[PDB]
Scaffold this active site. Sequence first.
Site, PDB file in Angstrom:
ATOM      1  N   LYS A 102       0.813  -1.221   0.000  1.00 38.26           N
ATOM      2  CA  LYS A 102       0.000   0.000   0.000  1.00 38.26           C
ATOM      3  C   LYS A 102       0.849   1.276   0.000  1.00 38.26           C
ATOM      4  O   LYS A 102       2.078   1.224   0.108  1.00 38.26           O
ATOM      5  CB  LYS A 102      -0.937   0.001   1.213  1.00 38.26           C
ATOM      6  N   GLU A 112      -3.503   0.627  14.583  1.00 40.03           N
ATOM      7  CA  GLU A 112      -4.618   0.759  15.528  1.00 40.03           C
ATOM      8  C   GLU A 112      -4.726  -0.419  16.508  1.00 40.03           C
ATOM      9  O   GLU A 112      -5.250  -0.243  17.601  1.00 40.03           O
ATOM     10  CB  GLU A 112      -5.961   1.014  14.805  1.00 40.03           C
ATOM     11  CG  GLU A 112      -6.570  -0.169  14.055  1.00 40.03           C
ATOM     12  CD  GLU A 112      -7.928   0.140  13.416  1.00 40.03           C
ATOM     13  OE1 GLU A 112      -8.794   0.771  14.074  1.00 40.03           O
ATOM     14  OE2 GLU A 112      -8.148  -0.273  12.251  1.00 40.03           O
ATOM     15  N   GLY A 468     -23.358 -30.127  65.733  1.00 34.28           N
ATOM     16  CA  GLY A 468     -23.455 -31.549  65.444  1.00 34.28           C
ATOM     17  C   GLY A 468     -23.942 -31.970  64.064  1.00 34.28           C
ATOM     18  O   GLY A 468     -24.307 -33.128  63.861  1.00 34.28           O
ATOM     19  N   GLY A 534      -3.834 -32.598  32.806  1.00 33.20           N
ATOM     20  CA  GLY A 534      -3.907 -31.252  32.228  1.00 33.20           C
ATOM     21  C   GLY A 534      -2.542 -30.594  32.121  1.00 33.20           C
ATOM     22  O   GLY A 534      -1.595 -31.014  32.782  1.00 33.20           O
ATOM     23  N   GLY A 536      -1.285 -26.560  31.542  1.00 38.63           N
ATOM     24  CA  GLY A 536      -1.669 -25.165  31.350  1.00 38.63           C
ATOM     25  C   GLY A 536      -0.648 -24.242  30.708  1.00 38.63           C
ATOM     26  O   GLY A 536      -0.963 -23.077  30.468  1.00 38.63           O
ATOM     27  N   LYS A 652     -15.815 -19.213  29.657  1.00 39.31           N
ATOM     28  CA  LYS A 652     -15.858 -19.948  28.377  1.00 39.31           C
ATOM     29  C   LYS A 652     -15.973 -21.449  28.658  1.00 39.31           C
ATOM     30  O   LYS A 652     -15.515 -21.902  29.699  1.00 39.31           O
ATOM     31  CB  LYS A 652     -14.598 -19.668  27.576  1.00 39.31           C
ATOM     32  CG  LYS A 652     -13.328 -19.897  28.359  1.00 39.31           C
ATOM     33  CD  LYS A 652     -12.096 -19.619  27.527  1.00 39.31           C
ATOM     34  CE  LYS A 652     -10.840 -19.985  28.308  1.00 39.31           C
ATOM     35  NZ  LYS A 652      -9.655 -19.327  27.702  1.00 39.31           N
ATOM     36  N   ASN A 655     -13.274 -23.427  30.607  1.00 43.56           N
ATOM     37  CA  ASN A 655     -13.079 -23.219  32.034  1.00 43.56           C
ATOM     38  C   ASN A 655     -14.156 -23.846  32.946  1.00 43.56           C
ATOM     39  O   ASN A 655     -14.165 -23.592  34.126  1.00 43.56           O
ATOM     40  CB  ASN A 655     -12.844 -21.729  32.325  1.00 43.56           C
ATOM     41  CG  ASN A 655     -11.461 -21.269  31.897  1.00 43.56           C
ATOM     42  OD1 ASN A 655     -10.593 -22.083  31.576  1.00 43.56           O
ATOM     43  ND2 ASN A 655     -11.244 -19.965  31.906  1.00 43.56           N
ATOM     44  N   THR A 685     -10.395 -13.806  27.235  1.00 46.22           N
ATOM     45  CA  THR A 685     -10.309 -14.498  25.957  1.00 46.22           C
ATOM     46  C   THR A 685     -11.092 -13.695  24.916  1.00 46.22           C
ATOM     47  O   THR A 685     -12.288 -13.482  25.085  1.00 46.22           O
ATOM     48  CB  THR A 685     -10.855 -15.930  26.081  1.00 46.22           C
ATOM     49  OG1 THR A 685     -10.007 -16.669  26.963  1.00 46.22           O
ATOM     50  CG2 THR A 685     -10.854 -16.625  24.768  1.00 46.22           C
TER      51      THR A 685
END
Lengths: 816, 816
Positions: A102, A112, A468, A534, A536, A652, A655, A685
């Site tokens: 360009k 931006e 109790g 898992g 992370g 999401k 999670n 996210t």
Amino acid sequence: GMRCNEKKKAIFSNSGEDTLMEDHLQLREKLSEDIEMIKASLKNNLVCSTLNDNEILTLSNYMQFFVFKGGDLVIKQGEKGSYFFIINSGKFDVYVNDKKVKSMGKGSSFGEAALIHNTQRSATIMAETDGTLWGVQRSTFRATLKQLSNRNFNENRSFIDSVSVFDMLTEAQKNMITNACVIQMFKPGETIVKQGDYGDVLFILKEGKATVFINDKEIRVLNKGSYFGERALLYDEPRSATIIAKEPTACASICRKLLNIVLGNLQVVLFRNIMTEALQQSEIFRQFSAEQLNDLADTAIVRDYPANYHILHKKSVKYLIVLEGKVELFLDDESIGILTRGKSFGDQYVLNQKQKFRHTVKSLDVCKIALITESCLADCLGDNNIDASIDHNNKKSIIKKMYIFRYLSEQQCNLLIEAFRTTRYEEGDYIIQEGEVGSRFYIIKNGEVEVTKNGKRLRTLGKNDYFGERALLYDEPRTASIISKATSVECWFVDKSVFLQIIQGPMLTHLEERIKMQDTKVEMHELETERIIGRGTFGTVKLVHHKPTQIRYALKCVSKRSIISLNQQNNIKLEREITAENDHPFIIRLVRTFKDSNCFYFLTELVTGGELYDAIRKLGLLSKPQAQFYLGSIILAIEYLHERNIVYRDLKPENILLDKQGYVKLIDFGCAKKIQGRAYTLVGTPHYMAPEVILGKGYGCTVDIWALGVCLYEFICGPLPFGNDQEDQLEIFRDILTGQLTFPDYVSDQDSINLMKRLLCRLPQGRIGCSINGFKDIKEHAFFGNFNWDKLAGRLLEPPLVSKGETYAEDIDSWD
Amino acid sequence: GMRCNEKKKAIFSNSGEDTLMEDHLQLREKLSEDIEMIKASLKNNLVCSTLNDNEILTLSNYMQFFVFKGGDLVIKQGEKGSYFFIINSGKFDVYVNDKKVKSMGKGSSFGEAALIHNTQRSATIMAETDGTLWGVQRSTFRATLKQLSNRNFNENRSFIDSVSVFDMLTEAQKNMITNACVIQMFKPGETIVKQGDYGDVLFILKEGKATVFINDKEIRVLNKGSYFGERALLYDEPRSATIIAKEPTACASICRKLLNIVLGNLQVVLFRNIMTEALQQSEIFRQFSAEQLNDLADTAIVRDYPANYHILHKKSVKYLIVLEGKVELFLDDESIGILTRGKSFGDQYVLNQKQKFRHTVKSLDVCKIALITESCLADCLGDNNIDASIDHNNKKSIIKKMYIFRYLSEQQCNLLIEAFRTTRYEEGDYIIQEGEVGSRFYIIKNGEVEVTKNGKRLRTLGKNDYFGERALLYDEPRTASIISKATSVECWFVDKSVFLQIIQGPMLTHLEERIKMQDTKVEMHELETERIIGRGTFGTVKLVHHKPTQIRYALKCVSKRSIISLNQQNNIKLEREITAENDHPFIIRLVRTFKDSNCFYFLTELVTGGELYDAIRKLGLLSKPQAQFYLGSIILAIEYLHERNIVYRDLKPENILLDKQGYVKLIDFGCAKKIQGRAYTLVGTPHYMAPEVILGKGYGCTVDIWALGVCLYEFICGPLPFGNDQEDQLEIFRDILTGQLTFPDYVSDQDSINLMKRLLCRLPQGRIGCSINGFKDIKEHAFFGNFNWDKLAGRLLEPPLVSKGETYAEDIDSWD
Ligand SMILES: Nc1ncnc2c1ncn2[C@@H]1O[C@H](COP(=O)(O)OP(=O)(O)NP(=O)(O)O)[C@@H](O)[C@H]1O
Ligand SMILES: Nc1ncnc2c1ncn2[C@@H]1O[C@H](COP(=O)(O)OP(=O)(O)NP(=O)(O)O)[C@@H](O)[C@H]1O
Ligand SMILES: [Cl-]
Ligand SMILES: [Cl-]
Ligand SMILES: [Cl-]
Ligand SMILES: [Cl-]
Ligand SMILES: [Cl-]
Ligand SMILES: [Cl-]
Ligand code: NA
Ligand code: NA
């Protein structure tokens, strides 16, 4: 010449892109043409389009002048992005993959994305001629948007605080209408309000002056701080004057339509606050729910009396509240006291509905009184048997504070309350003996008791304390004695046998398993790891095995170096705090943490049904009942957190895990924060992020409700609603901010759609669930019309997917 | 509604003091009274007092307006310090140990230490009334001082580049006089120079206009870039005109007095550059030292000739250089070529002093010639035997490039050169055979040879290459064969036996031990640690033992986490580079490094005589000979580094160890940097830091010479010269910048004092050792009058302190 035998240590050395621009920076006076070009350029920017003229002018003055020669570097591909640029003169060429694309000159913009977030550059902008750039960094840009919106908010709040009609709003309520303030500019001569107009707007002068006219005749001038239109928010009244601005002047303004959306009817809300404050001076009504008290406020008979009037004299008035003035109470001919503003009377008669009202009440001056009749109370309680309901509800509010009972269905909670029996004890009687196997749970009706162990005393307990409860879940020795240490103590109690006829297997399993977790003090050396479940990036999530008890846990390992490198020393302890305090059935329960010179550790319950991300993928497009269940579940967890001023910020499907019974567990509180006012930091996210986080002008807990909208959209429609194909973050945020929300032709449920549109409302004040009622508006939405919220928390619903065997995400000591 | 089965990761969160000030920040127009108050306030600041009006005005406009209410926090004790503050209105109270001390209002200043360096606050400044502050951060303040001084320097350099009289200065020389430029303001009407004045200043217009007059009659106007006074730097001449400024105008200016201090006589320097360029086109003079060539330039006979003149025709001219014009060379009647500007002739006659000059030389136009006679050469060489000296010096320059020889005394180096013998080889003759034990070192006189190992060839070597030097130090098998691969190859050689009659024990031990270090490829697992011999906070320094060879080393261990936390990822690799390349006898020699997931490693020679810090403490006040030795030694190490564009930046007795023989070893290159222009970052140990680092307007290698001044002061006087009692850094820097340098009454040596004052000269251009001659001015200072620099590097001096046994500081694979 003696020498110091100390030791003295040396000072050490410390962007890359920010270093280059510093070379090209120069001072320049900002002309009319400069300001208007920048002002034009910013109004085409993704972030700045919503901003008014005053805000954009503030931004403009923070722009810096940069001067370049031909063939000089501005931005390079793959560098960390910090500046945004408006070309002022000359030409600038854009190299992508080192191959020209360009050509840009005066008016054009680039970089931006750097404003939104630290991001890797796409092209290499190069200077062809001796051209110049107006520029601003991210830090400066975000800080400037923080201060403008924050000062706007604080100033508007002070003005709210100095408008008398808002004096009886709660803290939370004032904060909510502060957001409804619209700033409204007026030039000289412009009439702000006109005499005889049926206006519905309150105005507050920030800075400036304005002349008041009645019947075309000047009356006075108004100065900064003055306000008008209070009565217009409550009633339909013509303006009493024509107010006209003298000089350039700025008004903060609230309209009745927005107030009514945000707050509800202002009269109704004020009165409930007043009544609730009054009613809570009584020990009886202090045990009522907010809803019960609000209904008493909504239905109370309110009457104005002349002086020396006998308001009561021995209808069916049970309770009396002085709104205005003063009354004197009398038992036969003896005055027993004078009730002033906000004081009340009638405890005796509220507790004994059949009892003859014996007192009389006499106005000492012109007064306003609220009266609560017997049928007013009965409507509130849902029962003609007032004394029995009040008692029933006293017991209810004691047990609804305990984990064991507070999530049971309402029908189960009632049955259990009705099954309570009463015994009386002499002093020195061993209510419970340490070492024996219990079968009973106890609430103290009257008097006091003493908790002891092997002789040594631990504490004292009195009216409406309980003890109790473990006897209800396990057969085990009592670890303390409970000795009656008052004359004629009375306890309510329930047998284990009765409890087991009421609570059904799934809830019982949940409770059995959960309460055990605190019993077992775990040490690191007692843990052996079975496998990894898992990964992370921060560290590892091992499935671990406690050798003494054979209970199975998850251990999240979090490397020190991953925390230190990102400046997350501040944040990891804030996470541990939030994670430790969470005590809700649909949120992961922490057991304890551990310290180590190499890595931090979270020991939590093991969850064996896999992520929700994968479950919706097995199910496909969820039907209404399945989406109700998962969204419902998420709603309760999120609502729990908002009640504690915690915004989750990263909702999401990834999670959320599923437990063995198919009920959800929210995990991963790395993005969560205790919200002390408005939050500004950009976290979460991108596909789930709300537009107000992106736009940098302040957000709150409302962000999690937008995310809920995203989730429902994936559940019902399938794809994400914004930027579903996009990798490029800039384009994701663009679709979030200005993209069109559409729904595919196969979505056949008008209520689901209605709900998805209102959860995905771009402005928080228009978004369902973000007004004074909170989640109630969501829970009562027609989408949930057939859905029993009661049975959800109580594990009495068939969930969408129960895992056959265990399933993990496998192929797919102060902390300082 | 298919769903993406990707995964998308979340964005994470990121001063404390900088957050608070952002709340109080507002815009404000800068009035006349504001600018003058700030301008007054800065002229009392520790840093800004030296700055001229234009620089302070730039600073002023970067100040930000801050607004506070009564009882609001500004600064708190123990927080990290970032801002400096000038009180504009109201009163501000100062709490030390949370107990009120002072009261400040308009004109007063606080937090000046934050500008110098990130530092822990002393007091808590609090706002009493509704008062306001003008403020600026460190980052902004330091960046602004960088750009002002840097642009000033670059602009002045371009102007130097466009003044014709400086065209023949070297790069380094132009950079040095750029620093001598003084900026000089002129109003309208002010005469810049007057006709007939014997001025000595060159002027260059930066921006503006000025009228030229000859005998009171206007001649022309001068525009930005125009200059005048070139000839005034070379000669005593009256100004040819009266130049008067028309508009406001700015001149960059150089004076002959400063030039002469910085550069020496400009004519002399220019001519040496011209002569050196010419002489180096010959393969003979290219083997001469810079000093030899400069002496040829200083003593050359320079003559102007008419056209068609016979300059030479078969005195004692050996060499001829054309400065201007053109000449034609002739052998008898045949022209052999035309020599234009900078070309030369006479190689044949320079090499054979007895040979009859057979050529003739004839000017083709008016010309300027430099002539080098036989006695000119002899003076340069120090010897009537030209051919023998030239040959001697050819050999000298070959061996002075090798570690083994380059530090030997001059007398030893001469004796060794004189001991060279010559042999001739036939082609295919094995000069050296792999596997045999050598006793000879070889330099190739004529032709070529081939380096081979077990048949496979490695490389080719030719004229003035050398080989087999190890045979001089060890008895060991040759690891390669050297085969004569040309017709009748000739080598110079020296026997081991002769070498050992020349080199004395201490140097021999140094060499034996040093050259071995590369032989032994060390692996981490081959190292066992004997003990700890140091503790840097960053990590550990273990004394290690190589099991195969029994050689003993130091291993510095450097934790990853200490590097990552401070953002020293950039800096640790720059240190490894510098540390690896250092190959000087008085600087620590690196062996290799190692990588590891937990910590970086430097394997270096073990140094067994302890720190210099402790040695001067055993000795007390050093006598002249002892201070010469240690300062001398430090000088050679530092000079070595400056030659490689390395500024050390942390010179202090702690960073110098003593070896077993009592000779020094500079260690710890954490603060060292490859200097690409002017450096700005604030690094080092406060008591040793030069004022130009502190003042933030640019520095270079000169900083290490100031530190040398500090060291000599401690050695001779005892205490440090500045801030000897001070802990507080602000007060240390204050004593460095404005304190009085004094010397106690027991310092009885006028030369030591003279030297200490000139090393501790606050302005670099006045500081001995920082002019064009470099360290030569230091080495030839009368302080060193009796000191043999030659014997220092060659370990032929009795050092001040030899350690009995070993002594450590005990009680006191790309890196990414
Ligand atoms: N208590 C648990 N029971 C079972 N699985 C768990 C448990 N805690 C974590 N996991 C699994 O481990 C994964 C990683 O945990 P998580 O705390 O989300 O890490 P992270 O650093 O945020 N990265 P990410 O994998 O993108 O979520 C989760 O997504 C689950 O699949
Ligand atoms: N090769 C070596 N031989 C003997 N001692 C050494 C050697 N290298 C380091 N030391 C010792 O170990 C100390 C620490 O090394 P150094 O590189 O200066 O660490 P540091 O991180 O800069 N901290 P500091 O102890 O203040 O100098 C030195 O001051 C010496 O006493
Ligand atoms: Cl509140
Ligand atoms: Cl009423
Ligand atoms: Cl019991
Ligand atoms: Cl140079
Ligand atoms: Cl001459
Ligand atoms: Cl040999
Ligand atoms: Na997760
Ligand atoms: Na050191």
